[PDB]
Every structure is written in C-alpha cells, then in structure tokens.
C-alpha cells in the first residue's frame, strides 16, 4: 500500500522583521530564533544576540527587510551564512530548503531569491510558500482567514484550498512597532529617561517614582544612534510584553483607572506603577480614530480589517472564513487581545454566520505558526514531487518558481 509522511532531510526558514526562525523539517518548534536586525561596520556583519549586544565603535544597526520583503541582499546573505555555519552546522548542498515569503511578495524578489539559493548556496532543491498558507496548515486548516499582527503590519489574509486570495488582502501599519512608538511617547510624556542596559555599570534600588541611582560605564566606545535606538527598543519591547493589556470592552478612562496597577522596573532601577495608560495605548489597534497625532480617521481597526477582508471575498467562501479565524503574530500576545477581537467580531459578523476563532494563544504557536506549517508541509510524502530541483532551475531558469510555487 502506502505509508504516512516522509522525512527527506529538509530545512525550513521563516525570516521576519523581528527574528529569524530556522530549523529542520519534522520538528514541532524552530531550532533557533535570533534577531533579524544585525550590526554592520564599514563590510563586516555581526549577527545574533551575543555578538550584536556588545557595544562597538561606528557599528550601524540595520534590517535586510522592508515591508516584509528583502531589500539588502548582502545582509540577507550574511544572515543565511551565519545560520548555515553556526546554527544548522551542515553543508548547504545536501539539504532541501523550504522558505516562507510574504503574501504580497513581488515576482522579481522571488526570482532573485531562487537565483541566490540555487547558484550561490548550491542547494539540491527549493520551495517557496506564503506565510498565511503555512499558518493555516499548522492548525490543520486549508481554508480560513489569517490575521497576522507582527512588528511592521497587521494583515488579514484569506486562504482557500491552500492558496492565498491576493485580492482579499487588507494591510494596516498598526502593529508592534506602532505600540513601541506609543510607549516612547508615553515615557517622554512621563519624563522617564530610558537608559538601556549597556550603559549601566551598576545600580541601586530606589522608591517608586524617585530618581534612579546608577553609575555609567566609563570604558564605553562611542556608538551610533541607530544601535542605541535599537537597544532602547529592546527595553520597550519587554515593557510591552509585561505591562500592556487590552481592554475587554471599549475603553472608558474611569473604569480603567479603577483597575489594579502593574509595577515595572527599568534597567537603571527606575520603577513606577502603571494605571490606565497601559490600556489606553493598545486601544489604538482597535479604535485608531482617538489616537493623538495620528494621520486622519481613514485607518482601520483590527476587527474592521478582518470584516473588510472577508467582505472583499466571494460570498460562497465567507462562511468558511468566519468559521476559521486564525490569529497569529507576536503582537497578538498582548493580554486580552484575542477576547476583545472575538467579542468585536461577534458584534459585527452576521448572525447567519457562525464565528470561530482557533485556540492558538501561546508564544510558540502565535509566533512560529508559519515555521510549523513549513515543517508539516515538508514532512508530507505527497509534497515531495512539488520541490523545485536544481535540474529544473538549470533547464528553465529562475522563472520556474512562478509556475511551481503559486
């Protein structure tokens, strides 16, 4: 007869703006997860936290990606070389590679990526799939609406029979980076001087709201403003993960003020208790019209993004989209995000349609769904005919990826 799956020695890479997820196919979690941002000195590149977090003179901090697509190919190549050398620790010519890509990735970047992987790394086989499809596959769904709220974008992607419906995509920029900017504005309003850990030699405990008592390292080299801002944002991201909480209903200041506070201590020893402002900040994801200094009321909340994306699809598949809403991305891990989204969508979905959000609320499942789907797909024995081979590339060139990887 037949057997179940089949393991072929493949590798799965899912590269985002925030971190690079990589590992071997067949495993249920990525082997490694390190930041996508890297240092440059001029070029010489420094990758991963242990080399990135050390201060160094004239070292700029960059990203290879822009709008979810590759711009700096030298940085991307450096990241891949680092991943192959230090983390995978195996020769690249032996392992097939399945790569994740953005739903909106252009043809030219797909062709350039295929050319890079086949001609430089000399891999034996290649496949390229979109994030939403793998996110659906990780939850056992072929049809469903993927809501991915990452760092750069909050996007609703409808999926049907393992294919992205590109004309139904709705992008919004309100995501983790926007929340980081709002936290920066909050600290400026509160007159909270933010000192990253690298500047601190030692610290002493102090009271709530009192000035910090800390000593600065004397042996520091002069560092660029980009690296300093990246280090500050690393602190603000911990603040996001710790303190912020979505209001269960529409934000009322008098109700949020009565909630218990949350204590947070900064690396320099400054500490204070945070009240309603920790709930006012993430409310802009859902009701951006009340945000201060935001450019116009034209932009959409998360629920309205979902409904617009579903309404732009064919009427026959909308039950299948509302019956499987797969929430994904790290920014969805803010406390009570999913409950608020479910309530708002229940208030806006038609009563004739049943709404069902997939139970997915863990860090591993929310952040690494695309990688898990890639591992699942590469582990299928039915999939093994779908690889682009090196022979196919040498015969048909880089244009074969459009035919073979829709």
């Amino acid at each position: 007869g037949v057997y179940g799956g089949d393991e072929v020695g493949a590798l799965v890479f899912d590269i985002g703006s925030y971190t690079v997820r990589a590992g071997y196919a067949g495993e249920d979690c990525p082997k490694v997860d390190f930041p996508t941002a890297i240092g440059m000195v001029v070029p010489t590149y420094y990758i991963d936290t242990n080399a990135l977090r050390v201060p160094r003179e004239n070292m700029e901090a960059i990203s290879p990606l822009k709008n979810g697509m590759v711009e700096d190919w030298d940085s991307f190549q450096a990241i891949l070389d680092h991943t192959y050398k230090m983390h995978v620790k195996s020769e690249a010519s032996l392992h097939p590679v399945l790569m994740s890509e953005a739903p909106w990735n252009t043809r030219a970047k797909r062709e350039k990526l295929t050319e890079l992987m086949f001609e430089h790394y000399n891999i034996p086989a290649f496949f390229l799939c979109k994030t939403a499809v793998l996110t659906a596959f990780a939850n056992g769904r072929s049809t469903g609406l993927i809501l991915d709220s990452g760092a750069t974008h909050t996007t609703a992607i409808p999926v049907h029979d393992g294919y992205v419906l590109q004309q139904g995509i709705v992008k919004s920029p309100l995501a983790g980076d926007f929340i980081t900017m709002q936290c920066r504005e909050l600290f400026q309003e509160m007159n909270i001087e933010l000192v990253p850990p690298y500047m601190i030699a030692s610290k002493e405990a102090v009271r709530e709201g009192s000035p910090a008592n800390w000593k600065r390292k004397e042996k520091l080299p002069q560092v660029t403003r980009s690296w300093h801002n990246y280090m500050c944002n690393c602190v603000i991201q911990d603040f996001q993960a710790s303190v912020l909480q979505v209001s269960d209903s529409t934000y009322d200041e008098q109700v949020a003020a009565q909630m218990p506070t949350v204590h947070y201590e900064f690396p320099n020893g400054y500490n204070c208790d945070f009240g309603a402002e920790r709930l006012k900040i993430p409310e802009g994801l859902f009701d951006p019209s009340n945000v201060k200094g935001l450019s116009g009321n034209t932009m959409l909340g998360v629920s309205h993004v979902v409904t617009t994306s579903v309404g732009m699809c064919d009427i026959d598949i909308r039950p299948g989209l509302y019956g499987s809403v797969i929430v994904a991305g790290g920014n969805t891990l803010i406390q009570s995000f999913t409950d608020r989204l479910n309530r708002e969508l229940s208030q806006k979905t038609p009563p004739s349609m049943r709404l069902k959000l997939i139970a997915n609320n863990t860090t591993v499942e929310r952040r690494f769904s695309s990688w898990i789907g890639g591992s699942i797909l590469a582990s299928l024995g039915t999939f093994q005919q779908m690889w682009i081979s090196k022979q196919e590339y040498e015969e048909g060139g880089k244009q074969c990826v459009e035919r073979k990887c829709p």
């Binding site: 179940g4 019956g323 069902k356």
Partner: protein
Amino acid sequence: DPDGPFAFRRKAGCQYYAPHLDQTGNWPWTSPKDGGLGDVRYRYCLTTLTVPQRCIGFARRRVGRGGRVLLDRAHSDYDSVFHHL
C-alpha cells in the same frame, strides 16, 4: 412573481443542492450532527483496554508518524464518573 427575480426557475437536466434553513452548517470536525457533518474519524467515543486500566473516557484511534497507532483523549466533566462508573 411571489419571490421576485429570485424565483427558482428550474432548467432541464440540472441537479441542485438544497440550502440549510433550520440550522447553520458547520465543518466535518469540531461539529457533531448537532451543527454539522459528523465524520466518524474525528469522533471520540468511550473506550476500554484489555490491560486492566479501566475506561479511559472518550477517545479516537489515530495513526501517527512511523506507523504507530495512538489513542487520542478528550476532556469531559463526567470523567470522574466514567472512572469508577
């Protein structure tokens, strides 16, 4: 025209699927007949083992990777009753 433009003007030779009027449909899974198609491969049922460990409550049989046959299990509020039933 009672139904307006949307009268069911049948055409010869065609076949038609009726709509769900009484209850909204649902997937083949996470969905009993009280809501949707109950494909039995997704169904959990009470099960007993020949080794003396008792009724294990609701369960399916599923083949995993490597040809290994596993028993899934599902939570019930009456698991304490299914044990010492």
